[PDB]
Amino acid sequence: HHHHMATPHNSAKVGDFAETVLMCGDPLRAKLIADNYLENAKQVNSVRGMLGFTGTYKGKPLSVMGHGMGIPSISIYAEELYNVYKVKTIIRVGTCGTVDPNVHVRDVCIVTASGTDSNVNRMRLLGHDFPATANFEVVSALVESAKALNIPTQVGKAYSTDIFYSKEQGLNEALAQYHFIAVEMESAGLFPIADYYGARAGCICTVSDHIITHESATPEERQTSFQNMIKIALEATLKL
Amino acid sequence: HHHHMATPHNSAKVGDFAETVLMCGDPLRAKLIADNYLENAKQVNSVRGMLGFTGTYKGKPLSVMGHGMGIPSISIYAEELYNVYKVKTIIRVGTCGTVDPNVHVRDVCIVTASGTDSNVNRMRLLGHDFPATANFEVVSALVESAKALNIPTQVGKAYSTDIFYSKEQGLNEALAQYHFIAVEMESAGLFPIADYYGARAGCICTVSDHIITHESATPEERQTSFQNMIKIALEATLKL
Amino acid sequence: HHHHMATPHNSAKVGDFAETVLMCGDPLRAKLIADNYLENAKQVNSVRGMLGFTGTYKGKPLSVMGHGMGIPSISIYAEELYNVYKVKTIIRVGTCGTVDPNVHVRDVCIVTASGTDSNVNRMRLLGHDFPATANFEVVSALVESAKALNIPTQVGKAYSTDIFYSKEQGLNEALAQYHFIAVEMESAGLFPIADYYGARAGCICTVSDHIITHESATPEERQTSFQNMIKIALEATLKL
Amino acid sequence: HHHHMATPHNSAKVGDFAETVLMCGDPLRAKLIADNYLENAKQVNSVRGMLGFTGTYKGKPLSVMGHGMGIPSISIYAEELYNVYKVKTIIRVGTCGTVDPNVHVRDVCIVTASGTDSNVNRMRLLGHDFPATANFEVVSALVESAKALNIPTQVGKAYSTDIFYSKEQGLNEALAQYHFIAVEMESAGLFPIADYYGARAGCICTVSDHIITHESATPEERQTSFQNMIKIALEATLKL
Amino acid sequence: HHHHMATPHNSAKVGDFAETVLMCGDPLRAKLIADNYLENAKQVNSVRGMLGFTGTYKGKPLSVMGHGMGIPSISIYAEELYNVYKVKTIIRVGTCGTVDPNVHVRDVCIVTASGTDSNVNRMRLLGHDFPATANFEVVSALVESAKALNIPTQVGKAYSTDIFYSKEQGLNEALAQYHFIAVEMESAGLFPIADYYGARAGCICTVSDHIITHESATPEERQTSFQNMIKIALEATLKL
Amino acid sequence: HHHHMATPHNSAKVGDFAETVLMCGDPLRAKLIADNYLENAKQVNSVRGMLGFTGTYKGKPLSVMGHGMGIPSISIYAEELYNVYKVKTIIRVGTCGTVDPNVHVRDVCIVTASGTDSNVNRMRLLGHDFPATANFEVVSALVESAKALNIPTQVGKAYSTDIFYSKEQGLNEALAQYHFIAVEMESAGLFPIADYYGARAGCICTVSDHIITHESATPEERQTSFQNMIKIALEATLKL
């Protein structure tokens, strides 16, 4: 049968999302997070297969939902979460590449700000440079959580690209020269939306591939990296 | 268990896609298309929930797969289809809004070229204007199929935006002044990738909403529009 | 003596242009077309030497006029034709270069859309990518006319440059990679003006030079190519 | 019969142009200049109707040729003149509009530099601002010639637009605020080409229309303005 | 007499700067800081009046130097400090305006990242968006120092403009919508230079003026704000 | 004690500046100019160490003040001079590099217009190319003064960069190809401000360094070049 749609992309009823949300690109990973780390969990969205869930982590309300790939996709889901669902804090949890000579596969990267080759932020600031900037309380909560768990982290800039299959000569060299630590596809679209709503966002990623040396984490290594990163993010939500 | 991954985003084995592929944003709609219009069908991808299927339509090999929302998402899937899976023709089948005073909800729009607010095409052509242009044989096959089915069509330009939740003053007025017939989020990313691979692409969409008058198709009207559009696209594949 | 000027650039009286117009860059070629293919012909413009003529082709009203070289020049003449002279359809008939490895000197190219290094289309669409797109009925009429005449054609993208004497490294390689078939100087300015007026435009060109291999048509070869192209265009006007 | 073509656009033999050339948009005006002010005159180009002539003014070699409308057109002709024909000095002689509150119809404007909405100069200077700048000796020769003839002049910036039929809100107000004295379509393309060849250029125009007040010179007033301007330019060539 | 110049703009000998440097725009304020907060102090630069000093704060080496007004000025001085003088950490200490409805005159703002209307960061990252991002350890040291001193702070984005005397409609509204807390002229040029050198930077400012409400701190209020901010910065250097 | 501030950056009382002002980057050089060439001199500004002075040169009122380094710095000081202090004419007197093969160290360069990599002029002219253009009477006064003093000059374009420490491949080659004679950091910001106020500006510089050949003037050679340039500028003020 037909269900009421609070947004064109989300079947959750208003109020069905907690004020704090973790988001990852893969909806199947959102389900894994819910099934393994949330209690009191219920599925709240199924539209487009973009699974979302709401429950608790250590008693505190927490939701987790997929965001798909790229800035336009996360922008739809995050705009709706902040606007319609009255979410206050989103932490993107993801994987990334790196070009930095001192960042290695399996490293955990906490993002302070994100560059991009998208136009979406120029369009928000009269064509000027608008830094997609993580909220400091969120960054700090991630840093402090990792410290308490004795998990080392890299803290610094990400670069969110519209083009996974890059053909762009000189890009990697410039990213490395300025010590961008993470290359991914979404965080630069998230932070300005949080700003618009007077809300908060951050991002944490694990390095799956070194773009320069060609090193790549195995499936088991990616699972271990994910377990470290997700525990950092979950513990951080208790501070937010 | 773990399966071999021919790409990071697709579990299909090389050869598991037909040379002709229909793509829509919603993977659940890809499943509906497969279940109702394909024979000899098998599911060939499940990664990220982005369902894809291969079978036949009236005996001719045909695949259907979801592409997600926005240019970066379709770019990943389409690049892989043309490159790794050796696809020759992709037709995007979707829904759209319109601003044009003479285009109405439920109309079928066949896209000849697509504008965009993305930077991805400037990056391919030394910063210049690169029109995302549908292949003429594909456009013609869609037009002729609709004529044979006695289904009226609008033929003309689309506009692919990175931002579903537009805040941009004057955009709708400019799109209307120049008679853009469809507003959507992906086609401008598809056509240049087809060009790169010496392959073909097109797009057909049904109008779900009039952005100016605020008219909106009901669920049943959207189903009827989808049935008209999908039959046009399927019959067109027989010519391609 | 002094004559009334309906525009600053055209001495034709309102009504002196047919609803369908062929335009070429060289006004002396416009005169050749009129003298050899039109009946009932009269010269209707002489301002700036930009000869224009109105008569009939196989009984149907048809005009032919020069447009000069480059986007700003065609923009003046075409804006006036659509606005003041109430023209409905303009077909640009021209010559072009090519970089595509499978397009050859003397080939006839029918343009579906045109890229450019001009800013004129960004200025029309809030700085975004606005594809200069030929009207589908015009493209189809050209394609079908060539088929009936048994003249092979290439159908695809043109690139309209402001700079005949290019010094731009990498441009030809990018145009070839994305299979632009024609390099010329005007069509990208024509199509958006037709859009503004709710009117129609297209373009057909013959390849005079291969920019990569350095092949070049002789004067006699250019005359033969012109005869093929002009017959296609004239027959197409009967369908428009 | 067929004649040798030193360029694709000019039938003049190498050496047939003097080192100093006046250019105006209208080839019929080039003929008027030759017929009324040059001695020893011969027509040296007829291609595309773009008449050009070479003779003497007060015994000194001088050529005059049309350049057509817009930056791409003047760029073709001027590039060829400096490169193939070894011209040293080009003075553009034209008409213009004005928005400046203290510039009036029939005023003579001597151009020191020209702004533009074209991309051609960004493409020459790595995307940066490259001022299209008149040569100082040329500007000074025009100023001093007008002084000797007791003809008042305005000296300052022009703006060269690609779009005669402007739809651009706020442009006139900005041009007026910064005291641009002349609005025309070509000079910004001429000066950088002179620079490339280590050569010289300038521009002088008469105001035919006040864009703000709507005043417009009659045909007779335009003839008188032209006579003043052309005498200034001709006398200036004796100093160059 | 003439002294050796290690850079064109700085008479300090290599080694004469500490590894940690505070910089403010006004060199006379650099002198005030040195005279009132440093021990073991010596003047190390006088070129262009851009006073710089080196001494200790609570025993730890610390320098303080003026940077002048605007991105190009700070870029010269900071590039030299990181490159020639082997500085590791620069904290910019300044004043700012605000547009944010919840930021007030006399507030202390700690900058996490800075937007800009300059092109300098696009030029470093292939024309893309490169966020000028403060180092997290520096931000944290400033935050923790203010907490220990019981001084409230605002933490968030700055905007560095090239134009003190703005005429730009809509800028303040956009800055407020996205909750930029500080409007100043230099920090966006500092952070990318620190990145290039593998070094660290941050910025702290006091609000002298509310751009919207027109409130303005008196000289005495500015002195009190400066005393709070400088103590935070000095204590932070002990952690860096 | 506290003094009244007519601007945030200048302690001069309204009326304390002459209508004609020389400006140089280094305030200590402004003091040298005042002390050695002005009579009736008084210091009128000390804020930020940006020394300014007013007196007479050969009996005519003249001021001299530092402007600091870069477009944003000169923009502050010059905007205030034209607006608050009612200055009519500013001549920037400076040093520069050159890339031109025929310009040599110690040459005096008189600037007719200035290119830039700044965005400040695009922001004034709706994103278009706005040439920073010197006033012709000022240029002419400088040229004629140098002639009377028998000092050779180069007259032509400058390029004002935001980045002293360039890392930009191909920039020098392009500047040389188009015969830019002076590379400096401020003049492109000055001329448009003079335009806004209906006032006049110019620039004269001496070549301290050849960027290509690596030649560099010694301190004594720079003093001699400065003496030549300053005498030209001072004599020019008598004509303005």
Ligand SMILES: OC[C@H]1O[C@H](O)[C@@H](O)[C@@H](O)[C@@H]1O
């Ligand atoms: O975690 C999934 C990962 O998938 C893709 O590579 C992109 O969408 C990344 O931005 C994202 O982090």
Ligand SMILES: OC[C@H]1O[C@H](O)[C@@H](O)[C@@H](O)[C@@H]1O
């Ligand atoms: O059909 C689904 C529809 O969904 C969204 O609105 C966008 O992704 C469109 O581009 C697409 O057509």
Ligand SMILES: OC[C@H]1O[C@H](O)[C@@H](O)[C@@H](O)[C@@H]1O
């Ligand atoms: O046909 C003439 C031909 O001339 C020039 O090369 C350009 O104006 C082309 O765009 C045009 O096609």
Ligand SMILES: OC[C@H]1O[C@H](O)[C@@H](O)[C@@H](O)[C@@H]1O
């Ligand atoms: O003189 C002719 C005049 O014609 C048009 O208006 C444009 O080409 C101008 O730039 C030119 O000055």
Ligand SMILES: OC[C@H]1O[C@H](O)[C@@H](O)[C@@H](O)[C@@H]1O
């Ligand atoms: O502190 C001085 C203050 O001066 C000016 O307003 C600008 O240079 C600011 O960026 C700076 O903060």
Ligand SMILES: OC[C@H]1O[C@H](O)[C@@H](O)[C@@H](O)[C@@H]1O
């Ligand atoms: O004269 C001083 C000189 O200093 C620096 O190099 C820049 O500010 C130049 O623009 C200026 O000319």
